[model samples]
Target chain A: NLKDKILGVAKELFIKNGYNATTTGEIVKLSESSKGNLYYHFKTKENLFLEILNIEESKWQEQWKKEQIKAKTNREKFYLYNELSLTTEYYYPLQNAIIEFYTEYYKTNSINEKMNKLENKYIDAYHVIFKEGNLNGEWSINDVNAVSKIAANAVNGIVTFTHEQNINERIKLMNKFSQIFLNGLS
Target chain B: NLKDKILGVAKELFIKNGYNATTTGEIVKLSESSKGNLYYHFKTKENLFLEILNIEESKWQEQWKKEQIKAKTNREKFYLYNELSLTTEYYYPLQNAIIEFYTEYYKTNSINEKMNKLENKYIDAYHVIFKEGNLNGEWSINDVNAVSKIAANAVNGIVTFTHEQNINERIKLMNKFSQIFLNGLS
Candidate 1:
């Protein structure tokens, strides 16, 4: 319970100041967590932030998948994914921290594996939409496997690490691209 | 001349054993230079590798630009980019070294700027193709700017960090995506 409370405070601070700017001392102070207790729960601040990210990432995945189920048509599914894409880990408040963490820790074998698996999950989600489109004749994408990869990558390309556009603009562009992707398939 | 020689040796070693794995001692040994000579030329192995990667990256950019100039139509330009996408820094023999270097030293502000500029070059190149297509009435894309961002990111998404696909398979997928992108725009 204390660990969770610590994470909640850390998440808030991490979102506010980012990973580099936020100090562990502040987290302990705000969470009312003792330095000994915090370190016992998390070996380091980086570890604590990572655990928070992991929880947030999984929560977003579940949310996206549930929202995906609400779309009846393949085209609608594409729209749904792009619409939901903005609010996922891609644009989470702690995204900068995640980016910093990923760049710093990517060389570690386990982190690399985790990232690849995470990407594969997104690709699989895209694959299902393409498969539905192919079966329903909404699009004539014979190579659904290849198409899914492209679709997943395309959406990922737009959202991942793109800070120039505001959320509204990003959403608009995504909607437009989704239409383009679907039309291309047709 | 000695600096260039060390770079060549470093390039081979880095490409083969990767950045973290390759040692300066091995580099000096293979280059037939004393450790003093190697250090005299490069302050660190990372600097040496960065120089090698810069040369290699520029070489690929020049080669790709030359090939890009041969395309007669806007659509052909898209095909050219996707086809040549595999041969660039995006997927080179030294990709592992680049990945390691980027991850480990990403906090270096200059490195961040260099990477952003490099990515911008690719995006700007894509923008030209999209802008040309729109101007020539080949595609009725109202937002060439947005389309270019999407196109560039889509191609980038497919190629960057995709080690699972062989060159042939990656090229095939790129071609498929080019068609989908063009078809969507049309």
Candidate 2:
């Protein structure tokens, strides 16, 4: 109960101020929880923020799992992935603040691993889809590994770090990219 | 003359010692140049390294221009870009050091603008080719701007910040991606 309270306050402050500017004392103060109680729950502010990010990351995956049940084929699931990736749920509410947090801690091995984890998870899922796609003669794939990574890049990098764009515009870009990736422009 | 020597020496040192470890005095010592001369040529170590990276960036573009002379069409030039983007000229010898340099200064507007400059330049070029492609009845084009960005992202993101892989393998990946972008799977 206290953990959620602390988390809610931290999330609000992080969204308002950012990871760097939001302090432990402020979270404790605003949450109406003692420093000792907060420390007992999260160990450190880094852990607390990570839990927030972790929760957000899983939400997309869980929703995608449920959403993909409607797809008749893995190919459709793949397209669904690209389409849904641009939805409001995917945009980190505190993205501007997260950028500040990332710059400082990105060099760490654990942080690097955590960053790669999401990409790797998606790529693994893509690996199976591409495999099935190839077996079903969807497209001729010579090197599945390389092609899978490229597919993951297409899904993620369309606007991963780009300036703000309308959701409709981004979805259009993703759909066009999906088409281009599936079919040749030539 | 002394400036060239300083640059050469600084390049060697930065490559050997990285941006964090290398110092101005060490650069001056290795170049067999005086502090006054080195300062006259380059205001700071940051300037010298930027010049080094800037030189490398220009080298790729300059060579690409010469190489693209052999291209018969705008589409061919686009393919050449994907191929040349992976060559030695594109790989910074000081990349490891540059990562460190980037992390610290990336928040600055000048650095951000400079970092985005290459992507925008390529996107602008692709804008022309995609326009040409549409006019020639190549691909069904709805939005040139969105498609151009996806193409650029495909070219750049395939291996932009990826782990080490053989050049041939990377080329194959790029070629497949190029083909995929030009043609659809469906």
Candidate 3:
């Protein structure tokens, strides 16, 4: 229970204050877990953060799978993917913390390789969806490799730039973006 | 002057390391300036970074102005904007530092208002280019506001995602991405 408690608070503090600012001591106090226990469970601060990244990545993949069953086509999936990404634990909350951790506090072996891999996983998913659309006759993709990365990146920008906005605006903006985005594959 | 020397080294360290990781002490050492002199010129670390941000913004605007003189059409500008963004002082060097500084080390008044404003300036430029194309009969646009933001986000994605690649890959990838991005403005 203390481990779970530490995990929850670690995620909260890291998201709120950032990687460098959220000290292990702060995590201990907030979670009401002993410093020994925090270390016992996590081994180190970077380890704790990486564990959370792994958690969010799992959450993201499951979310994508569920959203797919509801989508009628790959075009709809592209729209839904951008909209769904607006609120995911991975994209919305951890997005900033992860980048800050990778860029600011990284002390040991590279973390963003994990970061880059998860990003490619999403980009590769875009390739699949783009291929699906191309096969559906909705569009003819020139190079799935390039188009997919662009699509993933566009969604990255839209989600990040719109994070400051309200949910209504986020959904509306994503829908409008998908209009240009998915269509351009033709 | 010591101020210019400090500026040059500050830019280098901040980009080479990151915003939070780069220290005023280190800047003084690297610039061979005294602590008091660094403070006298920069006022504070945040102010020093802001000054660099201001400098980069100026560089970006001038680059855009020059690129436009060479462009034959608004369509060319859309492609050119993404490509030019690849090597600009603003986009290439400072982008990572700005985001990390804003997210990880922001202690005073918001810096990313400057960051976000500069971003919107690029987005607003996208709107103007979209409108230009619409007027010039290159393509009909639905809403310049929506299309322009999408265009901006797409470029943001392309640039940031492709940042890890070689120059050849970056240019080729951007060229391929623009094929989908600019056409979708229709």
lDDT of each: 0.73, 0.69, 0.74
CAPRI-style docking class of model 1 based on DockQ: acceptable
Please give, for residues B17-94, the per-residue lDDT of candidate 3 as tens digits: 988788888887778976888777678788898888777777787779877877898878878888887877674566
Regions of model 3 farther than 4 Å from truth: A1-18, A21-48, A89-92, A105-112, A162-170, B32-44, B104-113
- Model 3 clashes, total count: 0
Docking class of 3: medium
Fraction of native A-B contacts kept, per candidate: 0.54, 0.47, 0.59
In model 1, how many backbone clashes occur?
Answer: 0
B62-178, model 2: which lDDT tens digit per residue?
Answer: 677778788777667767777777775443444455555764575566776665664565476578777887777666567788778888765656655443446787777777777
Runs off by more than 4 Å, candidate 1: A1-60, A69-76, A90-121, A131-143, A161-173, B1-3, B21-51, B87-91, B134-137, B140-142, B165-169
- Backbone clash pairs for candidate 2 read A182-B184, A182-B185, A183-B183, A183-B184, A183-B185, A184-B182, A184-B183, A184-B184, A185-B182, A185-B183
List model 3 lDDT by residue over A1-186, tens digit each: 788788889999988887778899899898898879987887889889888877777777877887788989888888877777765623476768777776654334365455667678778778888888888887887788877776777787676554334567667777887876666666
Query: Model 3 misses residue A134 by how many Å?
Result: 3.4
Write down the DockQ of candidate 2. 0.28
Off by over 4 Å in 2: A1-8, A28-48, A89-91, A132-143, A161-167, A184-186, B1-63, B67-79, B86-120, B127-146, B159-172
Q: What TM-score would you give candidate 3 relative to the actual structure?
A: 0.80
Candidate order by decreasing DockQ: 3, 1, 2
